[PDB]
Amino acid sequence: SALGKLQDVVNQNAQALNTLVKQLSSNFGAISSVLNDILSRLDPPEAEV
């Protein structure tokens, strides 16, 4: 734990990037988190929503 100050910065940046990646798997109330599934399953008036 001698170099914990640099490792904290590296871990915070990597964990923030991982959280930003994992936010793509959330639908945020939509029917799916994949844009291709929405564009292939729905007409554009509801796929727009």
Q: Which two tokens stand for residue 23?
A: 């936010």
Neighbour count for residue 17 (Cβ, 10 Å) = 10
Asked if 49 touches other proteins (CB under 8 A), the answer is no
By CB under 8 A, residue 19 contacts other proteins: no
Q: Pick one of 3, 4, 25, 43: the residue that binds other proteins (CB under 8 A).
A: 43
**Min dist. Cβ of residue 43 to other proteins (A):** 7
Q: Residue numbers of the site for other proteins (CB under 8 A)?
A: 43-45, 48
